[PDB]
Amino acid sequence: YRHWHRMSEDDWALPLDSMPEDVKTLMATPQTERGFVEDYWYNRIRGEATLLDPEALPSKSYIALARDMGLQIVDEPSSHMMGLIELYEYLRGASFVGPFGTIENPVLVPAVGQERVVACTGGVGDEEHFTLWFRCREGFMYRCGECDQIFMLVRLYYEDRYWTQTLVRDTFMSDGDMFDLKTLERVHKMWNKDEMVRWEVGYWAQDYVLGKGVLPGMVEEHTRVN
Amino acid sequence: NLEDHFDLAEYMMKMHNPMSEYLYWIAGFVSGLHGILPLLHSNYYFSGMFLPRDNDNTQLCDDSW
Amino acid sequence: SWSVPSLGIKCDATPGRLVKINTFIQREGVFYGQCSELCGTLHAFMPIVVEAVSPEAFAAHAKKW
Amino acid sequence: KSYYDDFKDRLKPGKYTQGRCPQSEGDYRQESKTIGREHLNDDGTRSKRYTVKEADALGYHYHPPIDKKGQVYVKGPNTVIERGQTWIKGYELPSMEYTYGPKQEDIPFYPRVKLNVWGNYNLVMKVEFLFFYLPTIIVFGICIPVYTINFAQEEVIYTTMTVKVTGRQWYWVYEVESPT
Amino acid sequence: FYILVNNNKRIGIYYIKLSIIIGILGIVLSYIIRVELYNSGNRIIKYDNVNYYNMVITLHGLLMIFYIIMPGLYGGIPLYILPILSVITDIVLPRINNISIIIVLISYIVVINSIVIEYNIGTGWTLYPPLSIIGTVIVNMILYGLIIIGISSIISAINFMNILIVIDGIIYVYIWSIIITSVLLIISLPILNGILLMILSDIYFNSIYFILNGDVVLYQHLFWYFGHPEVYILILPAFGIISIILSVLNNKIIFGMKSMILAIIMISILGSIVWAHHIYTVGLELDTKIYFNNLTLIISIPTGNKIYNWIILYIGSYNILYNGYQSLIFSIMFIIIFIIGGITGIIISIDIIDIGLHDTYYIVSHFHYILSIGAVISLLAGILLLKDIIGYYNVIIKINKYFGLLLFININIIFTPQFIIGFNVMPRRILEYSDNIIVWNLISSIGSISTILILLSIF
Amino acid sequence: IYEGQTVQESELIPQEDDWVIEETNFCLGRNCYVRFREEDDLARRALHQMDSQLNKMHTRLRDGTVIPYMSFHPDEMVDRPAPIHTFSEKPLLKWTWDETYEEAYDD
Amino acid sequence: TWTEIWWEHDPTPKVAQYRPYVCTVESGKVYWWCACGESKTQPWVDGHCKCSKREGGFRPRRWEPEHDGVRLFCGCKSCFSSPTWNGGCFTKWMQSNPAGGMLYCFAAAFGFGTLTVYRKF
Amino acid sequence: IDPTKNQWRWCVDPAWYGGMRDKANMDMYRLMVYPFFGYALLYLHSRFKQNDKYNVFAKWR
Amino acid sequence: RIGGPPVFMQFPPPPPKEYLADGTPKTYPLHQPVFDHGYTWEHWYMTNAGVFHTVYYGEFAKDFPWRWGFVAEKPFWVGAPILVLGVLCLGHIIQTMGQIGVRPKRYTPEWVEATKERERAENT
Numbered sequence A: 001y002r003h004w005h006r007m008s009e010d011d012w013a014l015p016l017d018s019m020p021e022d023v024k025t026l027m028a029t030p031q032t033e034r035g036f037v038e039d040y041w042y043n044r045i046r047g048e049a050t051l052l053d054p055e056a057l058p059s060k061s062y063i064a065l066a067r068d069m070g071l072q073i074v075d076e077p078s079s080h081m082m083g084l085i086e087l088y089e090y091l092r093g094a095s096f097v098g099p100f101g102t103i104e105n106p107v108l109v110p111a112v113g114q115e116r117v118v119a120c121t122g123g124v125g126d127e128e129h130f131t132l133w134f135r136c137r138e139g140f141m142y143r144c145g146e147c148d149q150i151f152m153l154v155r156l157y158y159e160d161r162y163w164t165q166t167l168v169r170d171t172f173m174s175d176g177d178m179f180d181l182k183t184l185e186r187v188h189k190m191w192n193k194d195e196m197v198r199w200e201v202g203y204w205a206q207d208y209v210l211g212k213g214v215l216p217g218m219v220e221e222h223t224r225v226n
Numbered sequence B: 001n002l003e004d005h006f007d008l009a010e011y012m013m014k015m016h017n018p019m020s021e022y023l024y025w026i027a028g029f030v031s032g033l034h035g036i037l038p039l040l041h042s043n044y045y046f047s048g049m050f051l052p053r054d055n056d057n058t059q060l061c062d063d064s065w
Numbered sequence C: 001s002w003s004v005p006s007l008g009i010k011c012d013a014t015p016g017r018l019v020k021i022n023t024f025i026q027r028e029g030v031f032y033g034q035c036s037e038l039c040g041t042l043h044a045f046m047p048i049v050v051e052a053v054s055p056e057a058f059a060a061h062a063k064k065w
Numbered sequence D: 001k002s003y004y005d006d007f008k009d010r011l012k013p014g015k016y017t018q019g020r021c022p023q024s025e026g027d028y029r030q031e032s033k034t035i036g037r038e039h040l041n042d043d044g045t046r047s048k049r050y051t052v053k054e055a056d057a058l059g060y061h062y063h064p065p066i067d068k069k070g071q072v073y074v075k076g077p078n079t080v081i082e083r084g085q086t087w088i089k090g091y092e093l094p095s096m097e098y099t100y101g102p103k104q105e106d107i108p109f110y111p112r113v114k115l116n117v118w119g120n121y122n123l124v125m126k127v128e129f130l131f132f133y134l135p136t137i138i139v140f141g142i143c144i145p146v147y148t149i150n151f152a153q154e155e156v157i158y159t160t161m162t163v164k165v166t167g168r169q170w171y172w173v174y175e176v177e178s179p180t
Numbered sequence E: 001f002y003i004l005v006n007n008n009k010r011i012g013i014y015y016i017k018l019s020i021i022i023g024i025l026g027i028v029l030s031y032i033i034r035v036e037l038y039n040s041g042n043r044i045i046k047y048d049n050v051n052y053y054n055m056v057i058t059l060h061g062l063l064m065i066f067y068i069i070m071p072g073l074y075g076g077i078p079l080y081i082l083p084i085l086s087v088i089t090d091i092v093l094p095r096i097n098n099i100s101i102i103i104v105l106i107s108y109i110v111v112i113n114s115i116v117i118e119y120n121i122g123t124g125w126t127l128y129p130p131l132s133i134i135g136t137v138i139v140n141m142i143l144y145g146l147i148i149i150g151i152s153s154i155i156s157a158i159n160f161m162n163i164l165i166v167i168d169g170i171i172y173v174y175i176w177s178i179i180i181t182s183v184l185l186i187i188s189l190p191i192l193n194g195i196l197l198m199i200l201s202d203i204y205f206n207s208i209y210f211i212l213n214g215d216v217v218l219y220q221h222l223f224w225y226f227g228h229p230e231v232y233i234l235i236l237p238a239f240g241i242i243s244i245i246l247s248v249l250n251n252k253i254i255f256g257m258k259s260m261i262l263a264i265i266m267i268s269i270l271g272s273i274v275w276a277h278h279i280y281t282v283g284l285e286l287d288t289k290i291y292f293n294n295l296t297l298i299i300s301i302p303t304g305n306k307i308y309n310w311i312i313l314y315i316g317s318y319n320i321l322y323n324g325y326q327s328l329i330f331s332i333m334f335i336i337i338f339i340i341g342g343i344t345g346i347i348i349s350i351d352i353i354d355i356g357l358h359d360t361y362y363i364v365s366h367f368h369y370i371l372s373i374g375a376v377i378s379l380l381a382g383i384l385l386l387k388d389i390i391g392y393y394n395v396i397i398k399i400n401k402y403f404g405l406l407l408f409i410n411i412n413i414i415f416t417p418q419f420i421i422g423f424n425v426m427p428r429r430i431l432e433y434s435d436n437i438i439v440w441n442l443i444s445s446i447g448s449i450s451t452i453l454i455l456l457s458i459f
Numbered sequence F: 001i002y003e004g005q006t007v008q009e010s011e012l013i014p015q016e017d018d019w020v021i022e023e024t025n026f027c028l029g030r031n032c033y034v035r036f037r038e039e040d041d042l043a044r045r046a047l048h049q050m051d052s053q054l055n056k057m058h059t060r061l062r063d064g065t066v067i068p069y070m071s072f073h074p075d076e077m078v079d080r081p082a083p084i085h086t087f088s089e090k091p092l093l094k095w096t097w098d099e100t101y102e103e104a105y106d107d
Numbered sequence G: 001t002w003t004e005i006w007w008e009h010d011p012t013p014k015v016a017q018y019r020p021y022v023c024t025v026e027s028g029k030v031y032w033w034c035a036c037g038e039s040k041t042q043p044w045v046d047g048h049c050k051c052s053k054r055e056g057g058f059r060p061r062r063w064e065p066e067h068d069g070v071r072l073f074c075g076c077k078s079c080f081s082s083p084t085w086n087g088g089c090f091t092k093w094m095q096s097n098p099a100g101g102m103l104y105c106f107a108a109a110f111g112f113g114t115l116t117v118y119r120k121f
Numbered sequence H: 001i002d003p004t005k006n007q008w009r010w011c012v013d014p015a016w017y018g019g020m021r022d023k024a025n026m027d028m029y030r031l032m033v034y035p036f037f038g039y040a041l042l043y044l045h046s047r048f049k050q051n052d053k054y055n056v057f058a059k060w061r
Numbered sequence I: 001r002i003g004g005p006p007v008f009m010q011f012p013p014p015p016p017k018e019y020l021a022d023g024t025p026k027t028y029p030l031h032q033p034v035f036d037h038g039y040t041w042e043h044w045y046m047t048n049a050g051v052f053h054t055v056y057y058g059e060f061a062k063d064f065p066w067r068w069g070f071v072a073e074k075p076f077w078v079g080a081p082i083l084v085l086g087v088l089c090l091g092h093i094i095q096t097m098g099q100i101g102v103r104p105k106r107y108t109p110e111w112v113e114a115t116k117e118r119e120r121a122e123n124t
């Protein structure tokens, strides 16, 4: 959005030193129990394990492929929530302009709390009036006293929580078959051999499953000076 | 917290200690004294009296008092 | 500031400026004025008194004084 | 009727000047020992420790509210499903008698009326023109007089006598040509 | 905390609180002046202590202008509502806002301390040289206060200008009023600082700008190049308040919003180019005098448009609504009073009329009707409108018809007679006067004591 | 200049011959100084103040919609007295236009 | 003339009197003012006029004095400050008898002109 | 890297991001309050004495 | 922004209520006095409650001290005129206390006549 500042380096990828060292437990943790860093590396390890196995991709369904990469198959419930989330974020630093509100289609006023201050400017052209500010509280269909424009408050609330991308992913995504560490090892040997590492994440991940320091050059990789 | 919602919550909720009000009035009273006390001091310094007697810088009748 | 309200004169006596004011008195009398620019302690104690007399009277006065 | 009599009972006249006993009889300056009131004084005011000496904004009692999933507790709406539709019942504020005291009866009638606007665009535009140009005319009526009187003061006159006037602290010196 | 707070609304309260405190000292000085002027003779100041009177009038003017009305109308109400009117969480520069109020207090302490410790002499609030540069150290202290005050004013102006970058709604007329005052400060203050530094150079660095071959009239140009913009920096916030009160209380949308805004912009530009109407009697060139007189009379046009737009706001309002609220009465009283002050301003604007009326009590009454009556009442009306939002209590003002009536009557008893003595004529900045001017001076003095008594009834 | 919303004669035609203008009182009620209970502490007096806000009040019309407390300026939209942090969720100024895009509709 | 020539959807009262009614009122008491001009207990609603019966858009006008005293009340039923009187009774009379209105206005202006001219001159 | 572990950014004012170091700097300056009052009060006494304002009564006795 | 200052947070529940040992609810300081006097008037004012609403605001005598209850009970145009004169009279009295018996010589008949002589000579 225009109100956001510049992408960080982390916005693209995370450093491999932030990979959890207990990979064996990481790949067995349920999604609802994974933190932001743990969830990043669960998806990256599992997603790259399937993508770096070309011979199996054509026989893998889009439902299974999306699960491996950690992408959520969309549906009307989740689409509604995500859309209203992105609309809330956009309105943080953007103007609020849209069609005239009526009983059939009230002006939708997203909010996290139970109230949001709103102003009615009336219709277009000569039907526009001076700003009339009012407090839009949930559970009431508001009508402007001047132009009769109907307003309504929409709350991004779900089960004692507000709506977030993390909440939407946890509520609607279902964990599939438990990730098999044999796949990690098999793909690791595929792209990492004879001092050539073409899957750096899988070389670090396999090292942790082995106990940290087992694979060649990994003790030297983990030895820091400050 | 509910106590922190309102700025100056104790005063707005009518629980503040009255001493705060007394200090504010005292501060104003001291500010006022900065115009009166130097007047008295300066009058005495250059005349020997803290305040004049009306029209004592002009000729007065014999019975004037 | 040299001010004589009856003569319609109020000219500031500023250091460095020699301001010219022209006048034509029409009637005899004594016209009283006061300094009109805060000039220090005794700003209120330097009045301006101008007496206009007949030309024959002015000549006699100037000759004697 | 007298509406004050309705809520007279709630207003019990006070005993202490400024609503506090002498500090000797009860020390309101100390922090309350009641569980869950460590941030309050005995008289209910916030304690200096909570607000000044150990203010959280200064790094004391560091306790991040947001949880691991980036969530905070949010209270949901009062939802009521009905007629094949999910409804939300809004929270209505309590009767103003509870909060203010007067009994909410015999309220004078103030009808709904849309904003009182001035109409007749053509007429309004002419008035606004007059609001600006009537003063402009008056100024123009003063302009010519102002020029003339200014020119009059600064007129080269055939003066025949000079009086020099010097202003000193605090007297006026006068220099005049002496008759020959 | 108390001093550390950065909350913009708390700081707004501090500005009003400090203005009232410093205001007590201001009013006391005014009472001294009026008591002295009750008759001819010495009443409360000895003839050997006449220097104190000169200091009283000097400090009265300086404090009321820079430490009371300006901190109240440009620091108090603005810091409390402007970020709300702009639908923004808080002021753009939080830390700067805190230091500004602290600076004002510190400069006030310096001034009053200089009363107590230094010899008491005066040179007017306009600090004309050479008198200002031949005085004692009290003049040096006052200069430090003004320069320090200037720092607070400029940084506060920077703070308000930044609202344009963050405003999330519509720039209402009141917001426009503050922004333009901020612009007027940014352009006028740097010139004031320069001339004040030159006063210091002559006082403290053996400079010779204000001795022969150096033009003393130079100071008056640079001073008044800030002086007159100052009088509009003090009135424009009041105009902004009047607009909000009339629209809100009458439930009527502002009429000619764009003309109101463009009238404020116009007043500022014109107010930046008319300063020499304060220098009519020095002896300026004929064409200069005519230019300044012409442009000074033009300011009435934009100022007149605003007055008439206010009148139509009150016209036609519903009768059922109670009209005795103090805020509404004060707002209406402002229109009635400001017209008197402005019209007399136009009278003095004619230079030939000004020759008779310069340095007379007619000028006093003129700027009192606008400031001592109009600006004060506007600040009161604005605070009164925000009583619920601010939340103060323990006063009987909101609905007090006695206070409004007594104030209006008695304030006019003080300053209406000062117009009369302007054609008598009684010079300004004097304490002794001829016996034939006692009647009017006595009437005004009776008015001053009475107004003070009415200030006690609010509690 | 603003002169109200434009009305077409068709919109002024009633569906019944007995329709008149609804007589609903828009006076919110009788009020005075907010009166706190002595028993309530600082926290509970804060709740009391929050429940006495006129700008949270409205008038319900015959069709169930409510006309809220409205003001020309947002100064009257914060709790009275003003809290330390007021507009946490940015107040939304709603502008209206005739532009539309197909994605918003479904056939 | 709003009801007469501009708007035909507001109730139009009957003039009971082209002069205000003088009545003593007490603080803390509520009074009900006739808005139709057909009550026989003027200036108050009698329980039998249009206002009392809520007929034809006529309703009683609630009023309450702040202080005790004698107050003028509208008889023409059209004063802007109704129920209180502000001079609209005379104005409405002039609309109904414009020739009489001119006579009074001339007389009032004549007196005002003489007095102001005599004192200033 | 975990976004939820940086809440001290808004929970703590920037002037005290330094923990004890920043609290110490504030506390040290706090200790200088009364020394400043005595110093400032001395300046007032110095000017008051140099202007012969203490001899107001002795002058006329 | 994950882990940033939340847009909205719910208030935590208020601290436990305090009872006295006998069960009486513990009361806290309250600056809303019930002034003692014989006045019981109640003044009501229709007030702006926004754009489309009003509120009937009432002022009760018991909420004010005796001095205001006394003054506010009377009709405004009975009190106002008396108060105006009273304040003016008091001001003059105050300003006359410091000049009781002061008799400047320039206001005596002899000096008054001499000024008339000066005016005649100067045609003032």
Ligand SMILES: CCCCCCCCCCCCCCCCCC(=O)OC[C@H](COP(=O)([O-])OCC(O)COP(=O)([O-])OC[C@@H](COC(=O)CCCCCCCCCCCCCCCCC)OC(=O)CCCCCCCCCCCCCCCCC)OC(=O)CCCCCCCCCCCCCCCCC
Pocket (backbone or CB within 6 Å): B008, B009, B010, B011, B016, B017, B019, B020, B021, B022, B023, B024, B025, B026, B027, B028, B029, B030, E002, E013, E016, E017, E020, E021, E023, E024, E383, E390, E392, E393, E394, E395, E397, E455, E458, E459, H041, H044
């Ligand atoms: C123009 C006038 C008329 C106007 C009329 C129109 C008005 C319209 C309405 C205007 C409304 C504006 C908006 C109002 C918003 C109010 C918000 C508010 O209340 O905020 C809460 C705020 C604080 O409340 P809080 O949140 O509970 O604060 C808790 C504290 O933070 C913490 O509590 P704590 O107890 O821990 O506090 C610490 C306390 C600790 O205090 C103590 O321990 C005090 C102990 C007792 C001391 C008492 C004084 C002793 C003096 C002795 C003097 C001896 C002289 C001997 C002479 C001998 C001669 C021979 O203090 C200190 O330690 C420091 C005190 C420093 C300040 C006081 C300074 C006094 C003057 C000093 C002068 C020094 C000169 C030196 C010169 C040297 C030269 C060399 O309230 C106040 O501060 C009080 C405000 C009261 C007035 C509010 C407005 C009411 C409406 C207007 C009424 C009219 C006023 C007229 C002006 C005054 C006339 C005099």
Ligand code: HEA
Pocket (backbone or CB within 6 Å): D134, D135, D136, D138, D139, E126, E231, E232, E234, E235, E277, E278, E296, E297, E299, E300, E301, E303, E304, E305, E307, E338, E339, E341, E342, E343, E345, E346, E348, E349, E350, E354, E357, E358, E359, E363, E367, E370, E371
């Ligand atoms: C906020 C305070 C304020 C305000 C608004 C004004 C406004 C004006 N002032 Fe000012 N003035 C002062 C404060 C103020 N002044 C002070 C404090 C001094 C003395 C400083 C000192 O010397 O120490 C002073 C001095 C002063 C003098 C010096 C006189 C002298 O030194 O002898 C003059 C003369 O030009 C002047 C003129 C004006 C004019 C022409 C206006 C205009 O703004 C007035 C405009 C308003 C109107 C004209 C009325 C409203 C408009 C209408 C009703 C439209 C119809 C009217 C017409 C068409 C004319 N002022």
Ligand code: HEA
Pocket (backbone or CB within 6 Å): E016, E019, E020, E023, E026, E027, E030, E031, E033, E034, E057, E058, E060, E061, E062, E064, E065, E068, E069, E072, E124, E125, E126, E364, E368, E371, E372, E373, E375, E376, E379, E380, E411, E414, E428, E429, E430, E431, E448, E451, E452
């Ligand atoms: C805005 C500034 C201001 C204000 C309010 C006043 C108010 C008053 N002034 Fe003013 N006065 C000046 C600015 C002001 N004056 C200036 C700039 C000069 C010229 C200085 C010079 O000559 O060098 C001057 C000169 C001056 C003199 C001339 C002395 C002389 O030089 O010979 C006299 C006495 O005649 C006088 C009297 C009064 C009186 C009796 C009041 C008032 O007391 C009248 C009664 C009104 C009140 C008592 C209410 C005031 C209340 C407040 C200001 C507080 C407001 C705060 C809030 C609302 C939060 N003043």
Ligand code: CUA
Pocket (backbone or CB within 6 Å): C001, C035, C036, C037, C038, C039, C040, C042, C043, C044, C046, D167
């Ligand atoms: Cu010389 Cu004043």
Ligand SMILES: [O-][O-]
Pocket (backbone or CB within 6 Å): E227, E228, E231
């Ligand atoms: O100064 O006008």
Ligand SMILES: [Cu+2]
Pocket (backbone or CB within 6 Å): E227, E228, E231, E274, E275, E277, E278
């Ligand atoms: Cu000017």
Ligand SMILES: [K+]
Pocket (backbone or CB within 6 Å): E036, E037, E038, E039, E040, E041, E042, E043, E431, E432, E433
């Ligand atoms: K005197």
Ligand SMILES: [Mg+2]
Pocket (backbone or CB within 6 Å): C036, C037, E358, E359
């Ligand atoms: Mg001068």
Ligand SMILES: [Zn+2]
Pocket (backbone or CB within 6 Å): A120, A121, A122, A123, A129, A132, A144, A145, A146, A147, A148, A149
């Ligand atoms: Zn609308």
Ligand SMILES: [Zn+2]
Pocket (backbone or CB within 6 Å): G034, G035, G036, G037, G038, G039, G045, G049, G050, G051, G052, G058
């Ligand atoms: Zn009837």
Ligand SMILES: [Zn+2]
Pocket (backbone or CB within 6 Å): G074, G075, G076, G077, G078, G079, G085, G087, G088, G089, G090
């Ligand atoms: Zn009538």
